[PDB]
Amino acid sequence: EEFDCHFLDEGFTAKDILDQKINEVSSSDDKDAFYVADLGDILKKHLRWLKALPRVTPFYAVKCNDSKAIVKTLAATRTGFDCASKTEIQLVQSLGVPPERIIYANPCKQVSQIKYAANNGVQMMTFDSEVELMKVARAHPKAKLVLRIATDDSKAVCRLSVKFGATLRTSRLLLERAKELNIDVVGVSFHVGSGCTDPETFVQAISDARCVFDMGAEVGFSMYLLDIGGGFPGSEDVKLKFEEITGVINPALDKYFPSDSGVRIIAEPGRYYVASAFTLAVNIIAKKIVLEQTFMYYVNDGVYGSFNCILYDHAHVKPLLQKRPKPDEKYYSSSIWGPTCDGLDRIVERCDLPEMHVGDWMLFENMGAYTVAAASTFNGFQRPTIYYVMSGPAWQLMQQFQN
Amino acid sequence: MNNFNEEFDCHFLDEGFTAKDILDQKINEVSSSDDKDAFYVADLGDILKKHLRWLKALPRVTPFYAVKCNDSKAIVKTLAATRTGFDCASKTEIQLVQSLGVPPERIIYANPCKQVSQIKYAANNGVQMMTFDSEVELMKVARAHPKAKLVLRIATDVKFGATLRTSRLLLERAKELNIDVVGVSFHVGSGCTDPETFVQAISDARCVFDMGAEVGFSMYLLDIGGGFPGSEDVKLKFEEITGVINPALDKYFPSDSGVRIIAEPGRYYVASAFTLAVNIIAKKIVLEQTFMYYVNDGVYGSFNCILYDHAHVKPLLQKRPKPDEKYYSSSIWGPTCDGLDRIVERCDLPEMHVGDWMLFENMGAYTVAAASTFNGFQRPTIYYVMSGPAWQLMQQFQN
Ligand SMILES: *Cc1c(COP(=O)(O)O)cnc(C)c1O
Ligand SMILES: *Cc1c(COP(=O)(O)O)cnc(C)c1O
């Protein structure tokens, strides 16, 4: 099923296909959870990116969803790939992507994985520490390094301990140390992150990046690479939409990194490409009534599976009814639980739903990003099957991108 | 040492050597190379020691290992030879146990809320005993496994467990549907602070047994669940808990009644058998002087137990530091690019360097069982060891 893609007929949408599949299994007990993944939605996102950020080459953040179908579609589109590990580089290269379309954007890499990157021709890597420079000097001395700078997220849960990113002061010392070690630093990267309430944050990051560029010029480096990271929204169900962010980014790029300077601007979008492409259908496998009347529903995907995103990715999930609800239907306070025997495997603490029954389906939209990528087989429950769909016109568009 | 697939490969543990010595040897073996991937040493002899200890502490209670805690084939094979039962929650777990040769009468399907197709799989493969705590579950059993032997799971002091009031209604409803209810199960859970909770649970089970007798059921199976500690690094130790359980079992379920008592320990068997070695792969100094260490296992891997299992992890050095060695405030981070992939927020450590190893004891339970390959990082290699005397002990259990 990984390389199996189904046709999407004219006048149909991923939703219609989902409804059809649900109807077809209605008289049986084959009601495992499943995804419908519209590869055409990923192509749509790419067109939208090219239009909104014409100066920025997208490098898809593989970690967000490492589906071979996704990577193949994006590779056909000629986008780059941001890989954090040997396995991700192997996946991308296996599909035929040359090394110059890969950035190894992990600032803290095990020596053997740096060696793997060097052996396979991946030259560009990020870094934010002196020890990383020592490791690169030993294991990949001809690498092209991108300095990752810190970006403030005022809504992070742990604002004192920041995992990645050098301050400006540290950035100066790092550039000088790289010069001492005869290591080439070619640019600057930053990552604002998905939790971004104000687009001005991007402006600040771009300004800081320009500062580090100036620092590089002072130390004698030829810096050309600006990496504006990820965090762009992957669906319209957000307060701060993609186009508002890009409307604030493009003037900043024009001001701090004009095209005549020779800068090459890239980004590392992950969730932007894939979030809305996946819709998850789970089946209600068990039910309890608690006395006014409240309900507990048990479904066959949970926090150890697709909904790990609730804990790892700070996700909030909205259950949707497969069968439309009449205006007069009574809604009851309800909780939704995963299949595992763990008391913590709870998807929704409280929501309002009409009375549902075992065998009914619940749908979760925008489930592409940081869901299957982090699922486990805890308690022996297997990952939901993914059905990849693509229309004829979407395939034609992909062909155009291939030429 | 090198694995000859790790699943079924077991290494000998020589006389006078312990799991720690094997760990040191492996570390020494790779000291001059860059192959510094995280790895486990799993002492199957420790699991056999736990079984002997269980037999002595709870002589009336047959243990059914909770496979979900650690589904290692090596573990299940060792426990299967030991003749324990298995508590299975899904088709895959039942498949694993049966593949190793365990007959269905040594399997309890102790998931109260089962998908119909999973119930069907159990019926197809002869697993008759299942738990339940709801009327809807009874409806599903009547359709998909009508000859099952049902065990009523009762609540103890949100997700599972019927109240006594609900238990009465469930027993009557099961009688209406001609479904056989043979016993009661409860699960106190690991975070139990007061052992008296077990006494109340056993008393509640006795009440539900009496309720079953009133409606005409022959109740014989008492399942006291799990939650027993898997290490000595706990406030409430195993033997204190069993000291409170055994008098209650004698009072509420005397042997002459014909009751069969089982338990579902998971972490008790496996927690202390696994020691994890991770390598420091990156390092930062933050200016008095504090350090950030990055290791090659994290919250998406073995340390998912921090979020899923409320685990508190203690990093250990390979060699005990000198008393006057300088310690620094330090943080420990996982390998993934996620900002949340942090193992230790703050601890005191001597200055360490890239290539040094950090050890984590009592990492057997709810660690590898829930690890993912997020960001492409592979699950740590597990090296299984067993001494000759441990193998001899396993033979005695088997015969
Ligand atoms: C996670 C990550 C991304 C992708 O983030 P999204 O929110 O999915 O766009 C991009 N760059 C880096 C360095 C990351 O760690
Ligand atoms: C998880 C579980 C167990 C095992 O719990 P431990 O804390 O590992 O002993 C036993 N019984 C049931 C019903 C469980 O869900």
Cα B191 from Cα B94, distance rounded (Å): 27
Q: β-pairing, B357-360 with B316-317?
A: antiparallel
Quick one: residue A370, left, alpha or beta (phi over 0 = left, psi -120 to 50 = alpha)? left
CB contact under 8 A, A110 and B340: no
Angle at B361 between CA B360 and CA B362, to 5 degrees: 125
In units of Å, what resolution does this entry have?
1.9
Residues A57 and A99 grouped into a single domain: yes
**What is the number of H-type helices and E-type strands within chain A?**
12, 17
Interatomic CA distance for residues B63 and B79, integer angstroms: 10
Domain end call among A208, A242, A273: A273
Q: Where are the alpha helices (DSSP H) in A257-375?
A: 271-274, 309-312
Residue B226 lies in a domain: yes
Distance A121 CA to ligand 1 centre (A): 23
* B383 annotated ligand-binding residue: no
Quote the DSSP letter at residue A260.
G
Q: How far apart are alpha carbons B247 and B254 in whole angstroms?
A: 10
- What are the CA-CA distances from residue B235 to residues A337, B46, B196 (Å)? 31, 21, 15
| Smallest CA–CA distance from B341 into chain A, residue | A163
Which domain does B367 fall in, by range?
Answer: 34-44+270-386
Minimum-distance ligand 1 atom for the alpha carbon of A231: 7
- Considering its fold, how many domains does chain B have in total? 2
Ligand 1 mutation pick, B337, B340, B374, max ligand atoms within 8 A of CB = B337
Taking alpha carbons only, the member of A72, A76, A83, A80 closest to residue A37 is A72
Which amino acid belongs to residue B398? Q
Angstrom distance (rounded) from CA A48 to CA A69: 20
The Cα B10–Cα B243 span in angstroms is: 35
Spatial contact of A95 and A67, defined as CB atoms under 8 Å apart: no
For A327, half-sphere exposure in the C-beta direction (CA atoms, 13 angstrom radius) is 0
Residue type, A373: A
Q: Is the dihedral of CA A156, A157, A158, A163 positive or negative?
A: negative
Let me know whether B243 and B274 are in one domain: no
Burial of A241 (0-12, 13-18, 19+ CB in 10 A): middle
Query: Does any ligand 2 atom lie closer than 6 A to the CB of residue B187?
Result: yes
Q: Is A373 on the interface with B (CB under 8 A)?
A: yes
- Asked if A172 and A294 sit in the same domain, the reply is no
Kindly state whether residues B108 and B38 are assigned to the same domain.
no
CB B109 within 8 A of CB B126: no
Closest to B132 measured CA to CA, from B169, B103, B96, B95: B169
The DSSP call for residue A38 is: E
Please indicate whether, in this complex, the C-beta atoms of B374 and A373 are within 8 angstroms of each other.
yes
Residue that the structure tokens 């954090």 belong to: A84
Residue B24 falls inside a structural domain: no
Helix, strand, coil % (nearest 5) of chain B?
40, 25, 40
A96 is a domain residue: yes
DSSP, collapsed to helix, strand or coil, labels residue A205 as helix
Residue B109, classed as helix, strand or coil, is strand
Q: Match 């929501």 to its residue by tokens.
A: A351
On whether both A279 and A260 belong to a single domain, the answer is no
Q: Nearest-CA neighbor of B189 among B199, B197, B177, B178?
A: B197
Any A CB within 8 A of B351 CB: no
B192 touches chain A (CB under 8 A): no
C-alpha neighbours within 13 Å on the C-beta side of residue A115: 9
Q: Does residue A360 contact residue A282 with C-beta atoms inside 8 Å? A: no
Alpha helices (runs of H) in A302-391, residue ranges in sequence order: 309-312
Q: Is A110 on the interface with B (CB under 8 A)?
A: yes
Task: Verify whether ligand 2 is closer than 6 Å to residue B110 (CB atom).
Answer: yes
Contact yes or no for B42/B274 (Cβ under 8 A):
yes
If asked whether residues A67 and A149 sit together in one domain, one would say yes
Q: Are residues A384 and A261 in the same domain?
A: no
Contacts of B392 (CB under 8 A, 6+ apart): none
Whether residue B69 has its Cβ less than 6 Å from ligand 2: yes
Domain boundary, last residue among A273, A293, A308: A273
Are A310 and A367 a contacting pair, CB within 8 Å? no
- The verdict on residue A16 lying in a domain is no
Q: Is B17 exposed, middle or buried (0-12, 13-18, 19+ CB in 10 A)?
A: middle
Specify the amino acid at residue B259: V
What share of residues in chain A are helix, strand, coil (percent, to 5)?
35, 25, 40
Q: Name the nearest CA neighbour of A200 among A149, A265, A151, A166.
A: A151
Q: Are A319 and A364 in contact (CB under 8 A)?
A: yes
- Please give the radius of gyration of chain A, using alpha carbons only, rounded to the nearest integer: 23
- Determine, yes or no, domain membership for B29: no
Which residues make beta-bridge pairs with B348?
Answer: B329
Shared domain check, B203 and B120? yes
Q: Which of A103, A268, A367, A372 to mutate to test the pocket of ligand 1 (most atoms within 8 A of CB)?
A: A268
- Selected residue of B34, B87, B352 to mutate for chain A interface (largest A Cβ count, 10 A): B34
Per-residue tokens: B371: 């690890």
Residues near A238 by beta carbon (within 8 Å), at least 6 away in sequence: none
3-state SS record for A300-339: CCCCCCHHHHHHHCCCCCCCEECCCCCCCCCEEEEEEECC
Residues in chain B: 399
Strand A278-290 vs strand A361-364: parallel, antiparallel, or unpaired? antiparallel
* CA distance linking residue B149 with residue B129, whole number of Å: 5
Domain end among A273, A298, A314: A273
Counting one residue from chain A and one from chain B, the pairs whose CB atoms sit within 8 A come to: 181
Burial B368-391 (b: 16+ CB within 10 A, else e): bbbbbbbbbbeebebbbbbbeebb
- Asked, for residue B4, whether it belongs to a domain, the answer is no
Cβ pair B115:A339 closer than 8 A: yes
Q: Do A382 and B140 touch (CB under 8 A)?
A: no
Residue B81, domain member (yes or no)? yes
Q: Is the CB of B227 under 6 A from ligand 2?
A: yes
Q: How far apart are CA B132 and CA B112, in angstroms?
A: 4
Alpha-carbon span A95 to A27, nearest angstrom: 40
Say how far apart CA B150 and CA B206 lie, in whole Å.
16
Contact B117, A29 (CB under 8 A): yes
Q: Are the beta carbons of B223 and B264 closer than 8 angstroms?
A: yes
Q: Are residues A292 and A357 in the same domain?
A: yes
Query: Which of B173, B331, B337 should one mutate to test binding to chain A, selecting the residue with the greatest count of A CBs within 10 A?
Result: B337
For residues A5 and B239, what is the distance between their CA atoms, to the nearest angstrom? 57
| Separation between Cα atoms, residue A14 and residue A11, nearest integer Å | 10
Residue B162 is given by DSSP the state: B
Residues of A that are catalytic? 341
Query: Chain B contacts of A162, Cβ < 8 Å?
Result: 339
Using alpha carbons, select from A283, B371, B90 the residue that is nearest to residue B98.
Answer: B90
Same domain membership, residue A215 and residue A103:
yes
Instruction: Yes or no: say if B74 and B368 are a contact pair by the CB < 8 Å rule.
Output: no
Q: Are residues B292 and B378 in the same domain?
A: yes
- Cβ of A1: how many Cβ atoms within 10 Å? 10
CA B324 to mean position of chain CA atoms: 39
Tokens of A157: 């849960």
| Helical H segments across B88-228, by residue range | 91-99, 116-124, 135-144, 164-176, 196-215
For B133, residues 6+ apart whose C-beta sits below 8 A from its C-beta are A288, B112, B113, B152, B153, B154, B160, B161, B162, B166, B170
User: Collapsing DSSP states into helix, strand and coil, what is residue B126?
Assistant: coil
Q: Report d(CA B323, CA A328) in Å as an integer.
A: 73
Residue B14 lies in a domain: no
Residues A114 and A224 in one domain: yes
